């Protein structure tokens, strides 16, 4: 994926959250 464990620990741009599955968001599905 793009971020988190399923990307090997990358983070997200500007200010957004990173989903439990590993993608960027800033919404609950992507902060939880």
Ligand X SMILES: CC(=O)N[C@@H]1[C@@H](O)[C@H](O[C@@H]2O[C@H](CO)[C@@H](O[C@@H]3O[C@H](CO)[C@@H](O)[C@H](O)[C@H]3NC(C)=O)[C@H](O)[C@H]2NC(C)=O)[C@@H](CO)O[C@H]1O
Contacting positions for ligand X (CB under 6 A): 1, 19, 21, 23, 29-30
Cβ atoms of residues 32 and 12 within 8 Å: no
Shortest Cβ 27–ligand X spacing (Å):
9
Nearest-approach distance from CB 18 to ligand X, in angstroms: 9
Q: Could you give the angle at the alpha carbon of 18 between the alpha carbons of 12 and 22, nearest 5°?
A: 105
Residue number, 1 or 10, with CB nearest to ligand X: 1
How far apart are CB 30 and ligand X at their closest, in Å?
6
């Amino acid at each position: 994926e793009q971020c988190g464990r399923q990307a090997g620990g990358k983070l997200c741009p500007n200010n957004l959250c990173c989903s439990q599955w590993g993608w960027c968001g800033s919404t609950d599905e992507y902060c939880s």
